Design a protein around this nucleic acid. Structure first.
Ligand code: NA
Ligand code: NA
Ligand code: NA
Ligand code: NA
Length: 329
DNA sequence: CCGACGTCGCATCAGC
DNA sequence: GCTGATGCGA
DNA sequence: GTCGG
């Protein structure tokens, strides 16, 4: 549905969401506003009153009132006020740097640090993550066209197999669902030698990160432990041509017996996950990102069931296997 | 009326 | 030094 | 902020 349908209202609610999260530190209000904007974004009619909107789940009394004011005046007094406020606008802005959350943003602004330039001048006050976030501030806000995702995947899948051909690696996220662009790259990795009961062998991830660094694909590291890496990567510049933006990439090592529950979950979408979770319950199973387990008559979860593919999961709950490209809901 | 609204791996702080 | 809490991201 | 026990 076109943005000119309710884009004004949805923009307003998203701006409210950001201020609750970044300034008020009210995470649940952030999500309430986000949810309201989602349901409205999907609504295929131009809203004519707060009352019409209130019928939608997640739209309550107060948002209904704001929509009334917005519809009559083309704005919202409280939002106009907070936009102008130097402190709040700065705090809100600083959070766009990866590694700077509401707490760090507040603290920086309290001591007079309000702009990227200010940050640039105060490196000593920034942790490693925050320095990398600042360094790639613009690149991190750019999206990744699917063609670049495919090129990136080519590299990841090639180098993983080169380290050990028994690794299994899957790029997940909306990309796996066939999205035309991505925000980052999420890689789930496993190996037969690693299960929930056997060796947690703590070099499986390191060896892969290392090789990806060795071929100069991974350029920076935000964080890295035995099961999860978050960092930065860049396609080699196809020659004589402009250099590609630096991209965010996550790589997680998952036990083999939990790998497919992991792929399912990190492929999404979120709404699909929710519904699949519903259905599974109805069939007497509880599914999370790690395992699927039978529920007994009084609701006691038994042991995790063997899962050797995504479709195993669907089969446990009597659902026809659905392609990632059809998992919007 | 009033608590729930994922959860968790990693980096870093707070405290002992 | 260690343990647990907190910030952050996803 | 919204929902629901
Ligand atoms: Na409603
Ligand atoms: Na941030
Ligand atoms: Na942010
Ligand atoms: Na081999």
């Amino acid at each position: 549905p076109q943005e000119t349908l309710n884009g004004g209202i949805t923009d307003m609610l998203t701006e409210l969401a950001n201020f609750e999260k970044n300034v008020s530190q009210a995470i649940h209000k952030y999500n309430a506003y986000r949810k309201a904007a989602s349901v409205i974004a999907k609504y295929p009619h131009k809203i004519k009153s707060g009352a019409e909107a209130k019928k939608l789940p997640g739209v309550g009394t107060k948002i209904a009132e704001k929509i009334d004011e917005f519809l009559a005046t083309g704005k919202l007094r409280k939002l106009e006020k907070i936009r102008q406020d130097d402190t709040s606008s700065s705090i809100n802005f600083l959070t766009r740097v990866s590694g700077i959350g509401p707490s760090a943003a507040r603290k920086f602004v309290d001591e007079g640090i309000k702009t990227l330039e200010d940050l640039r001048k105060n490196e000593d006050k920034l942790n490693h993550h925050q320095r990398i976030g600042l360094k790639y501030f613009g690149d991190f806000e750019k999206r990744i066209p699917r063609e670049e995702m495919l090129q990136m995947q080519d590299i990841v899948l090639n180098e993983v197999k080169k380290v050990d051909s028994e690794y299994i690696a899957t790029v997940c996220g909306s990309f796996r669902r066939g999205a035309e662009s991505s925000g980052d790259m999420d890689v789930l990795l496993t190996h037969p030698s690693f299960t929930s009961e056997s060796t947690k062998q703590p070099k499986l991830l390191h060896q892969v990160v290392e090789q990806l660094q060795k071929v100069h694909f991974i350029t920076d590291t935000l964080s890295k432990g035995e099961t999860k890496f978050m960092g930065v990567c860049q396609l080699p510049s196809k020659n004589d041509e402009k250099e590609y933006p630096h991209r965010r990439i996550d790589i997680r090592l998952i036990p083999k017996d939990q790998y497919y529950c992991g792929v399912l979950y990190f492929t999404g979408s979120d709404i699909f996950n929710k519904n699949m979770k519903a259905h599974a319950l109805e069939k007497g199973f509880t599914i999370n990102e790690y395992t699927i387990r039978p529920l007994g008559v009084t609701g006691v979860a038994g042991e995790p069931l063997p899962v050797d593919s995504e479709k195993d999961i669907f089969d446990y709950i009597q659902w026809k296997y659905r392609e990632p490209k059809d998992r919007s809901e």
